[PDB]
Amino acid sequence: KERDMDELKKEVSMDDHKLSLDELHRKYGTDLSRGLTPARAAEILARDGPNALTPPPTTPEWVKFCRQLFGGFSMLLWIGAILCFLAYGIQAATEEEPQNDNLYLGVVLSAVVIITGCFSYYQEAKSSKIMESFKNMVPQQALVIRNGEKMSINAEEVVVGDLVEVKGGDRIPADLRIISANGCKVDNSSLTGESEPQTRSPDFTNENPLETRNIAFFSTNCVEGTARGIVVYTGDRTVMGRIATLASGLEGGQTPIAAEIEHFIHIITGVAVFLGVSFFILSLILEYTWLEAVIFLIGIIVANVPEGLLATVTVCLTLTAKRMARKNCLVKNLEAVETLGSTSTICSDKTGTLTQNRMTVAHMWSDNQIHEADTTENQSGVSFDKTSATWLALSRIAGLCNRAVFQANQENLPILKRAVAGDASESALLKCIELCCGSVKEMRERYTKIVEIPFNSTNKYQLSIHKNPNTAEPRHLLVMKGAPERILDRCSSILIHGKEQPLDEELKDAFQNAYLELGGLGERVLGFCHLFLPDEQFPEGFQFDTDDVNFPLDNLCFVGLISMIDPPRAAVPDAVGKCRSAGIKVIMVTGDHPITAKAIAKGVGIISEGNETVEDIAARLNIPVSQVNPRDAKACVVHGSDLKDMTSEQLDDILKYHTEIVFARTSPQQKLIIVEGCQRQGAIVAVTGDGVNDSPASKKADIGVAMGIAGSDVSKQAADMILLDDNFASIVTGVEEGRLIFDNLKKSIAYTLTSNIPEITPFLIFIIANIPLPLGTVTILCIDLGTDMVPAISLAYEQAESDIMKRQPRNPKTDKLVNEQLISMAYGQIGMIQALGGFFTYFVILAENGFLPIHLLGLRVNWDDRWINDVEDSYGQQWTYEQRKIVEFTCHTPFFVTIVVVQWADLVICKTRRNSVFQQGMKNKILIFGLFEETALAAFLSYCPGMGVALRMYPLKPTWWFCAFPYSLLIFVYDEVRKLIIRRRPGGWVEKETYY
């Protein structure tokens, strides 16, 4: 009944959070001041289960090696091996040669499955290891209150319904119902997606327990303040645990590349059984007994199987994955390298993914003007003009009034990514001043703080007073920061360019609409003001305390505003740009607040400039929002509130009729629903994420992508790919890489698939016209696994034939990896020219040795007979068994060499699908090498001493080498003009029939 379990997991949650504390404790059986009794606590602790998530239900043993050994391709090679073994078994009907033939073959197939298996296994293993190295779990002991006493215990020992205290920096041990708080801001960033730290209070605020202030959450750190709470949820029963278990409980789905290969196999086995059966019938139609016909059937089928191409695909993928890793983009899974290339929709998370999830100074107000700061992680932006004195005054105000100070070990670190002990805004400001204005160390200790007023619970003004460091005027300096309206209430004078002024409503309201504009921009704004003091009234020795009014809190000099938001990562906007450019649809899915979500969306280019939401229209036109026809709106911000009441057809419509989409305030379950919703459209979805709320989403996506650092552990476990350097631009490279490796796979495949014609046909017309067998089993192997290997790999190093990031994403239904066209080329055309070359070489050798081709017909019956030692050639001479058999084996070797010769041509034309070889060119070095090593190898096997003893491969007379030559040239010249006509006429008949 686990279906039902997950059915309750895809549903958004409920709670008891809205209760009189009286009723709360009445329900939980607890004292609010005293917590509960130690006996009770240990009674519950052992009543259910300690406070911790059940370790990931997955611990597949290394027996999972077995996984790599099957799939579907290794299956093809398995059934191949089995068929050969059965065939040899049937050849135990007699005294039989396959001691070197069929058992040899089946064992080889097995070897390829097992070895490719081991290789892929080792790769995925290696990735898992490097992921394990990232796992550091520090125990954090929770602070409980039991029998009135504060006791700090191991967090796993916390039970349901006991008083807990959390402080600045403390992580929330389990799900709490806040009963009391002071200035308490918890960081909900990864769990709900809320960017800025949300404050927590006793009071009930929002019906949805995730947005309410009276609940605190497991795995969230309290940024500041303190709070007490009764534990509502313990362990797996908690929120992040329900998310985590949903995430563990989801399905991977078949990767696009894997499917393309499945279809590929269907084609290959299709022609395999068509040939096998049709020829089985045909063989019976002649003479051969059912025995021989069955042997031929197994023969033709097994021969159709590409043993090499399993290696050459696995290696191909591994190479691309290596480059990925070089770029600090790691793929958990091996086939997960292609998926981006096939992706038509990216669902991305906002905070920690698209943004830095770090409060940072965005814009500043100087001389009634807005100057944007550099919001980038790396400082790749534009610095403002810091020459003005107004900025100097401001910067001193922000640097001096703060609780923000750098910690002990942050020196060598970059000023941004370095840790800071303080508030959100105070951290942003501290880093900003330490960056732009130089150091705040000697700067903050330059002026000596006398008495300061920390943020009041009401009005939230924060002031402090210091002595003078300048040499001219020795008056005391006063500084204060606070919310713009309150500080506007207390401010009179305004400063410009280093000289003062009073407030006129013109520029006062200029400040007002600048504040409303920056506020509207999504940023959080802070009023910054200062006042010098009348040192005649307040002497150098006057000690002012925080009791009565010492300083004129009014008639102060308002300087300006400093606004801040968590900025997008430096690389982000350009990246979303490229993804849109490549025709991928970018959807933002965030749990954050819509007002910020929309702004960040417009900022990273998910909502382009000038595109109006339904509400933008309603606002501009001054009408009820309900009035406007939603077709008129290209972009939409969908509140999660509505997303709960939405149906299948409704979400389908939203995704259909809106080009730029932002789902804001969306629960993890709903992220999952959106992804599934983009998948109902039948499109490939990639998800990019940071925290635990992207766990179920990242799992369900065709490809998930975590963030290696700013990503959480559950969602990293859920991801099919990890970004170690946390660079969003990698996504773009990803989609490029996978888009390229698709094309190259085709090439490789085509190449190998071309060789099955000149490989299979010898054993075909051997059965048909009864000629001596032109090409053996060992030779065929030397081609499949010996020579062609290096070229078939080298093909993977082929480059982009045009700009790929220009072209639209492929259609999974239409555009196929191996399609009717490719087979029409490999088997239909090029393979045939190859076969002809092979047979030509065969006849040159036999005709030269005294058996003229016409006389070779029907000969096999006696030829293959061991005991007929007088066998008439065309000249009347008599051959023994071993003599003529040596000519047959010295006829296998040149057939093999000939295959190589025509695989030169084939490898050069398989290099390019469209471009003529004279354009794309021979710049591929591995390919050249492939040609050299290939030819060298064939030459070696022919001529190495004792190879006729070992392989029954004999030295070629030199003239032999050239028989294949014209056939190769034909292949080259043929395909070149095909790839000319295709360029010239992209109508096109050649393009429709051939281009694959």
Partner: protein, 32 residues
């Protein structure tokens, strides 16, 4: 007699060839 072939020499050629053909392959993949 026409019943003798310098297989040992063609054998030698092909091998010496395979030797250069390979190490020229290696020069190529090592472009420095």
């Amino acid at each position: 007699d026409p019943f003798y072939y310098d297989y040992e020499t063609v054998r030698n050629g092909g091998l010496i060839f395979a030797a250069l053909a390979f190490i020229v392959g290696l020069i190529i993949i090592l472009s420095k």
